[PDB]
Amino acid sequence: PISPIETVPVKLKPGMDGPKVKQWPLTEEKIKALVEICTEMEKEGKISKIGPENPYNTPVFAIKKWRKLVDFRELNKRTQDFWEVQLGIPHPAGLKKKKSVTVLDVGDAYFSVPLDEDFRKYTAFTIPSIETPGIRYQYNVLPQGWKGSPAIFQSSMTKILEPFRKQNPDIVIYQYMDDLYVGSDLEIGQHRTKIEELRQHLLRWGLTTPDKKHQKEPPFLWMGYELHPDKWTVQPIVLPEKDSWTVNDIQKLVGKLNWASQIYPGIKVRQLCKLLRGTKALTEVIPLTEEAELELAENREILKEPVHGVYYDPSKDLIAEIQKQGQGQWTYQIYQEPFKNLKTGKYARMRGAHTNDVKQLTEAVQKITTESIVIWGKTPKFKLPIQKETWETWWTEYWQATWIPEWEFVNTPPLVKLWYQLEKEPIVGAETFYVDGAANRETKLGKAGYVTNRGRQKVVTLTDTTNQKTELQAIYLALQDSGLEVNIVTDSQYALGIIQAQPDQSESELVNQIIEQLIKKEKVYLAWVPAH
Amino acid sequence: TVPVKLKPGMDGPKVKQWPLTEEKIKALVEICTEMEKEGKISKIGPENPYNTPVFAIKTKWRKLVDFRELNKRTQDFPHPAGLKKKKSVTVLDVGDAYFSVPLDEDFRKYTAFTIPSINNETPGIRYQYNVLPQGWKGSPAIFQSSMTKILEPFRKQNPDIVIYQYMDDLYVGSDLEIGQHRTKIEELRQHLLRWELHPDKWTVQPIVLPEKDSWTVNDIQKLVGKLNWASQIYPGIKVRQLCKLLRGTKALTEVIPLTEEAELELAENREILKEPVHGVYYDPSKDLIAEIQKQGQGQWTYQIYQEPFKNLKTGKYARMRGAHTNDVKQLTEAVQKITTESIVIWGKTPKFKLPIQKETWETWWTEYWQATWIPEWEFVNTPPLVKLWYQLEKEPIVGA
Ligand SMILES: Cc1cc(S(N)(O)O)ccc1NC(=O)COc1ccc(Cl)cc1C(=O)c1cc(F)cc(C(F)(F)F)c1
Numbered sequence: 001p002i003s004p005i006e007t008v009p010v011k012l013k014p015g016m017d018g019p020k021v022k023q024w025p026l027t028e029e030k031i032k033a034l035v036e037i038c039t040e041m042e043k044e045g046k047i048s049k050i051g052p053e054n055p056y057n058t059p060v061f062a063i064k065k066w067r068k069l070v071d072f073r074e075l076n077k078r079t080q081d082f083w084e085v086q087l088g089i090p091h092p093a094g095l096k097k098k099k100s101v102t103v104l105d106v107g108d109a110y111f112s113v114p115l116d117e118d119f120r121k122y123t124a125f126t127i128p129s130i131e132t133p134g135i136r137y138q139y140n141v142l143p144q145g146w147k148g149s150p151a152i153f154q155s156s157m158t159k160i161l162e163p164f165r166k167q168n169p170d171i172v173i174y175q176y177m178d179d180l181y182v183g184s185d186l187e188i189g190q191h192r193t194k195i196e197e198l199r200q201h202l203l204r205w206g207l208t209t210p211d212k213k214h215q216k217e218p219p220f221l222w223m224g225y226e227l228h229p230d231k232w233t234v235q236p237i238v239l240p241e242k243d244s245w246t247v248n249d250i251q252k253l254v255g256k257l258n259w260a261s262q263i264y265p266g267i268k269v270r271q272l273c274k275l276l277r278g279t280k281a282l283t284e285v286i287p288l289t290e291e292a293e294l295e296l297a298e299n300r301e302i303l304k305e306p307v308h309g310v311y312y313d314p315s316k317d318l319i320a321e322i323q324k325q326g327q328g329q330w331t332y333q334i335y336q337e338p339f340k341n342l343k344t345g346k347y348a349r350m351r352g353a354h355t356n357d358v359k360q361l362t363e364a365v366q367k368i369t370t371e372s373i374v375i376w377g378k379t380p381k382f383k384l385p386i387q388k389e390t391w392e393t394w395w396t397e398y399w400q401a402t403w404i405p406e407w408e409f410v411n412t413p414p415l416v417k418l419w420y421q422l423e424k425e426p427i428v429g430a431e432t433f434y435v436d437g438a439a440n441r442e443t444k445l446g447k448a449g450y451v452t453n454r455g456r457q458k459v460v461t462l463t464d465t466t467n468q469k470t471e472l473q474a475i476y477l478a479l480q481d482s483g484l485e486v487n488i489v490t491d492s493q494y495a496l497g498i499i500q501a502q503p504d505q506s507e508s509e510l511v512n513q514i515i516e517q518l519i520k521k522e523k524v525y526l527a528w529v530p531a532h
Numbered sequence: 533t534v535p536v537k538l539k540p541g542m543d544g545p546k547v548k549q550w551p552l553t554e555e556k557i558k559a560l561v562e563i564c565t566e567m568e569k570e571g572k573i574s575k576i577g578p579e580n581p582y583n584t585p586v587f588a589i590k591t592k593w594r595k596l597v598d599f600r601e602l603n604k605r606t607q608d609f610p611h612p613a614g615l616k617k618k619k620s621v622t623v624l625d626v627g628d629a630y631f632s633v634p635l636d637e638d639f640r641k642y643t644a645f646t647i648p649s650i651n652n653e654t655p656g657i658r659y660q661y662n663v664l665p666q667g668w669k670g671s672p673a674i675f676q677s678s679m680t681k682i683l684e685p686f687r688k689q690n691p692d693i694v695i696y697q698y699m700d701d702l703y704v705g706s707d708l709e710i711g712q713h714r715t716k717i718e719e720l721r722q723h724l725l726r727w728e729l730h731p732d733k734w735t736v737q738p739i740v741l742p743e744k745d746s747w748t749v750n751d752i753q754k755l756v757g758k759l760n761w762a763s764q765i766y767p768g769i770k771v772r773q774l775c776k777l778l779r780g781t782k783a784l785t786e787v788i789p790l791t792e793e794a795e796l797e798l799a800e801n802r803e804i805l806k807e808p809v810h811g812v813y814y815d816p817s818k819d820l821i822a823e824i825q826k827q828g829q830g831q832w833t834y835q836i837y838q839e840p841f842k843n844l845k846t847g848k849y850a851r852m853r854g855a856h857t858n859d860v861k862q863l864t865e866a867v868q869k870i871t872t873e874s875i876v877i878w879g880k881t882p883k884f885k886l887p888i889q890k891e892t893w894e895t896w897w898t899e900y901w902q903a904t905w906i907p908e909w910e911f912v913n914t915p916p917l918v919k920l921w922y923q924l925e926k927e928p929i930v931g932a
């Protein structure tokens with residue numbers, strides 16, 4: 001049955017016209033099946049037999065009795081845009097715990113909405129002949145596979161659910177694709193009563209809701225998760241055992257494994273990723289190394305762990321703890337009460353051009369903050385492995401505006417600290433190295449060196465080098481040859497940046513070498529001076 | 533209603549809604565429900581593909597729609613140089629004025645906006661405006677004949693007071709004593725209710741070079757480095773004689789007696805810096821640019837200009853009480869203060885160069901925004917010298 005609901009005014013993109021796609025010819029076997037399916041839809045009021053007036057047409061096919069398939073790809077190319085049909089999908093950690101939850105499938109089979117009469121002509125299609133005229137039709141309802149159907153379907157369900165919602169504030173209904181999720185904290189019998197009242201309400205609008213045979217029951221499959229009444233678990237992750245792995249297999253496997261590192265602790269893929277080096281074909285077979293076999297082996301075991309979480313309780317605190325798993329790697333878990341996680345996560349190592357750990361910490365805090373607001377509409381209280389004095393010292397001086405929402409210190413190693421802090425003033429009694437480096441940027445031949453106030457000096461010859469690398473190399477040599485306290489003068493513009501940001505990680509192996517050196521010194525003062 | 537269109541070839545805004553806090557989502561739902569009843573806005577379908585960000589600010593919540601994009605695409609349509617001279621200016625929010633006025637039926641779809649749903653459990657609530665929206669370029673424009681009429685009396689009554697309107701704001705500027713000023717304001721509010729800036733003080737501070745009993749190699753180094761850079765603003769600045777004392781490989785800490793030539797060079801330089809570079813004038817055909825640098829510990833420096841090194845204005849902003857642990861709070865505060873002065877002075881907002889990471893700012897700025905308008909901004913990496921240089925800006929003898 002069709003619904004007695006107003007139509008939404010649809011239009012075709014700017015100036016474009018309806019499709020005129022030639023009907024792919026079929027076999028007598030397929031035509032008969034289509035002619036049947038279509039006579040059934042014609043009586044239901046879904047399609048209308050139409051004349052030659054219509055210059056438009058969409059191809060119809062036969063798949064599997066037989067099932068009909070209309071290829072609207074072309075209509076969809078010429079159909080106006082709509083408001084992005086709810087793009088962000090719900091995360092189980094944001095679902096409030098409810099006593100009862102029931103799923104109502106309002107799919108197309110059960111849900112038929114009328115089409116904007118003005119637009120119906122563009123949906124025209126033709127059932128071929130055995131040479132002679134074929135049978136022409138057009139849709140009177142939202143076609144399955146057409147661009148606007150998901151949006152108009154959702155908009156319609158919303159209009160229809162408005163009354164019920166105002167009348168049952170103790171009940172919450174979530175919309176996602178063809179399904180309605182209805183939950184409440186009412187007594188199970190009362191809950192069931194309201195579901196039935198709703199079903200009867202959709203029935204009134206032309207929505208024949210489900211069959212006892214098509215009713216979904218707990219747990220629920222929510223994109224890799226299993227939603228149980230009091231908690232969620234994750235659908236088993238299967239790692240195929242083989243004696244022959246191709247590039248494609250390894251990549252797929254890495255893919256599936258990277259997703260698991262989010263929920264599971266200890267997942268590693270370094271040795272499996274190594275297998276991808278120099279690969280010439282996807283089908284190419286790469287023998288697993290010894291370490292890859294072990295890694296894969298240990299992961300199979302980690303995935304046999306019963307990782308579970310719980311649901312949201314708005315009357316309780318929202319807490320998020322963070323750990324540094326390695327340089328640039330951050331792990332986190334958001335919970336309300338100790339050990340009962342709502343959600344856990346990991347942020348792939350960021351390979352910046354140059355940054356520091358405290359900065360990377362704020363970036364993790366910000367990503368979690370954004371995630372939380374989406375999921376819970378609130379920001380968590382943070383537990384960060386950094387002292388309040390370390391934070392104060394860094395942020396207050398840093399050239400860039402930065403911030404962390406309300407947080408507290410949790411002493412869980414390793415802790416994030418400032419690996420070094422350039423002196424504010426020149427060091428008295430410390431050798432002063434005047435460094436300098438130059439190179440022909442074309443020949444890439446250069447020299448680096450220094451001359452200290454104490455008479456010490458050096459110059460190194462470098463081939464295949466840039467001017468930047470020599471200048472930085474100059475600084476590096478001064479750091480090597482100096483004592484634990486050193487003043488260094490340079491006209492390097494990039495060094496000026498180091499004084500400002502004082503990075504502890506970067507893209508240059510050279511800068512990295514310098515940082516290791518900076519860290520090792522007890523005192524370092526960097527002074528920049530204009531060249532010449 | 534008068535027909536309003538988009539600039540030629542411009543299509544409507546399709547800006548996505550940022551996530552909001554449950555607090556703000558609840559607030560907007562309540563505000564918008566009441567507005568629907570009063571016929572100011574109406575729910576819309578999915579056939580309307582446009583969208584404009586919306587949010588709530590501030591002890592009850594106010595709805596604030598980010599129309600920057602739409603304002604840009606809206607067809608085009610004077611400034612009282614006297615406002616900037618006045619002793620005191622008070623700012624007033626006159627956005628409610630617009631609700632009465634209807635918006636062309638054909639333009640409404642472009643005002644579409646969405647109230648998001650927590651955890652994406654439900655589709656957002658879509659609306660569009662029926663009447664003039666607060667924050668849109670066209671509103672102050674359309675409601676102009678109506679605004680003059682209501683202002684004529686108060687104006688003609690007090691020809692000494694200047695009143696300037698920007699977006700939803702009204703800047704009232706006069707010369708009366710603080711009390712006589714606040715009194716004139718209510719007389720106006722009453723007049724309106726029936727339907728603390730000080731520009732003369734905003735003095736441009738000069739750059740001051742350090743003076744020392746004795747100078748060290750480093751002292752001169754840092755000094756010469758800044759003067760060199762500054763040579764881009766003032767070509768008469770010289771570092772020759774100073775750079776000579778820097779000959780050799782002395783210890784960064786060694787004291788260097790200054791030659792008489794370096795002493796004079798330092799004196800000529802101080803004199804040049806005594807005043808703002810000559811020949812800088814505001815150009816209406818050009819955009820205003822506001823650059824901010826984080827000096828640290830609550831201090832911020834900014835420069836307003838249109839051409840690099842040709843400042844129209846520069847200044848310092850010290851963080852306000854109760855903003856200590858919040859860099860984002862301090863920056864938005866500063867942005868609003870600078871934008872306000874900009875309006876007062878030129879009647880337009882400047883585009884900002886903010887020393888903050890995109891993600892950091894976009895996540896928290898609305899939490900401390902308090903203006904009806906929103907300026908344009910871009911995120912940047914502060915050059916070390918630009919910071920070191922404006923840090924040299926002069927400050928009060930004892931204070932103020
Ligand atoms: C899974 C469950 C079963 C029972 S019951 N009736 O005892 O079997 C009671 C509560 C729950 N769940 C909860 O407490 C928390 O979960 C929920 C809390 C409220 C609502 Cl309305 C639905 C759920 C879901 O479990 C759920 C399941 C899905 F597949 C998809 C979605 C959605 F699309 F909305 F994201 C939500």
